[PDB]
């Protein structure tokens, strides 16, 4: 229980409650050119691990006609903010069936209001 | 390589092995003493006791969960009515294993499996 007890002290609260199938917006830090600033990265969440400090989610954005996905570490001092803009029912845990579909086929349904 | 892995194969396929331990348990809850083989008794004690722990709570959902893994009317009837009530206040450790000699034909070491209060 000695690494299960160090890992309580790195965790200081940064994140709200959410699920796969949401549309989050993420404020990340940008360290370039000797000036720190923020940057907004908004997409749809497709994955979650829950190992403690080793928790990490994944969010897919369609930027300028090109897909991109970004895996964020949860308790990093880079992932600053996390807001939830929409939520819906998907009845699965990992949405990896959206690396193929593109447009109207990749619509998250709405049972959940 | 087997590092920290658990469960032994016994040189049977995975569907034989499921349908054999289901059949050694269903005969143990009729006669309450079985003369069996020693490596087959060390792995019977990881199948039988989750049926005795389950029998301590009567439910329609538990009598369906019990029927769906030891599939017999007589074994479900022998639980929930005799067992799970005789063992109502013993936490764990429901049956014992006593090594007994060797088989005549081969040398397969034997064992008894016996319920603990009988």
């Amino acid at each position: 229980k000695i690494i299960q007890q160090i890992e309580a002290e790195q965790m200081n609260k940064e994140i709200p409650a959410f699920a796969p199938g949401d549309t989050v917006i993420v404020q990340v830090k940008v360290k370039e050119g000797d000036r720190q600033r923020l940057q907004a990265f908004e997409g749809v969440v497709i994955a979650k691990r829950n190992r403690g400090l080793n928790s990490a989610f994944t969010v897919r954005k369609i930027s300028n006609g090109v897909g991109v996905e970004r895996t964020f570490q949860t308790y990093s001092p880079i992932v600053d903010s996390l807001s939830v803009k929409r939520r819906g029912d998907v009845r699965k845990a990992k949405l990896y069936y959206l690396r193929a579909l593109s447009g109207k086929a990749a619509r998250i349904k709405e049972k959940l209001v | 390589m087997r590092h920290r892995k658990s469960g032994r194969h016994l040189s049977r396929t995975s569907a034989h092995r499921k349908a054999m331990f289901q059949n050694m348990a269903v005969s143990l809850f009729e006669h309450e003493l079985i003369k069996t083989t020693l490596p087959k008794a060390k792995e019977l004690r990881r199948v039988a006791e989750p049926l005795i722990t389950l029998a301590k709570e009567d439910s329609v959902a538990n009598r369906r969960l019990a029927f769906d893994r030891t599939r017999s009317k007589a074994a479900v009837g022998k639980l929930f009515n005799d067992l799970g009530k005789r063992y109502a206040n013993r936490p764990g450790g429901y049956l014992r294993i006593l090594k007994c000699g060797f088989r005549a034909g081969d040398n397969a070491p034997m064992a008894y499996v016996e319920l603990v209060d009988r």
């Binding site: 000695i2 690494i3 160090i6 890992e7 790195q10 830090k29 360290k31 400090l53 080793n54 570490q73 308790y75 990093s76 001092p77 880079i78 | 390589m1 590092h3």
Partner: protein
């Protein structure tokens, strides 16, 4: 000198700026001193050092009387460290207090043993084909020697067997944190062996 610990699993800590430091956590029992080998009865100069909690019914009377020349009441293992020059008494106490930040150290230990390994895993050989006419030989070694002269296999040929649990030392790993309350060292990098093993932490001399 050095301190004897235990591998207790890998973790990961974050700095202020944002990078991740992979960290191996090492638990240290405070180490008692058993002997102090001087140079006039023994030649060399060294120190026996002992970690604790062995049951009383497992020590022989040869070892129980050996652990009572100094009031130690000792446990598992006796290790010995060769040292340049420092005085030590018979019954002393060696803690994690001689380490600081930075301070690149050496870490020894037994590795994890794989049973009886072939030549594609032990020595990283290459394989023959899989479809183009090939016979039973798909992962076997190739040839061994030359034909008529020398007529025998040279000593030191690379063949199969026992990727060992032999001793190995990782070299020049740096210390991230010293904890004199829960008795921890935090080392950035990999430490040899399985979790729950036994390990030695020595200040490095390669530098």
């Amino acid at each position: 000198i050095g301190v004897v610990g235990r591998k207790c699993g890998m973790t990961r800590i974050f700095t202020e700026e944002g990078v991740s430091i992979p960290v191996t956590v090492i638990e240290v029992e405070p180490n008692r001193v058993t002997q102090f080998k001087t140079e006039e009865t023994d030649g060399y100069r060294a120190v026996q050092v002992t970690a604790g909690e062995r049951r009383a019914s497992r020590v022989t009377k040869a070892q129980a009387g050996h652990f009572a020349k100094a009031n130690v009441a000792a446990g598992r293992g006796v290790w010995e460290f060769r040292l340049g020059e420092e005085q030590y008494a018979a019954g002393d106490q060696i803690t994690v207090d001689l380490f600081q930040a930075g301070q690149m150290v050496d870490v020894t230990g037994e590795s994890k043993g794989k049973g009886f390994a072939g030549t594609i895993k032990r020595w990283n050989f290459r394989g023959q084909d899989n479809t183009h006419g090939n016979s039973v030989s798909h992962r076997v070694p190739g040839s061994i020697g030359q034909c008529q002269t020398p007529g025998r296999v040279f000593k030191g040929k690379k063949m199969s067997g026992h990727l060992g649990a032999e001793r190995v030392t990782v070299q020049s790993l740096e210390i991230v944190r010293v904890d004199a309350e829960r008795n921890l060292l935090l080392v950035k990098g990999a430490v040899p062996g399985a979790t729950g093993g036994d390990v030695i932490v020595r200040p490095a001399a390669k530098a």
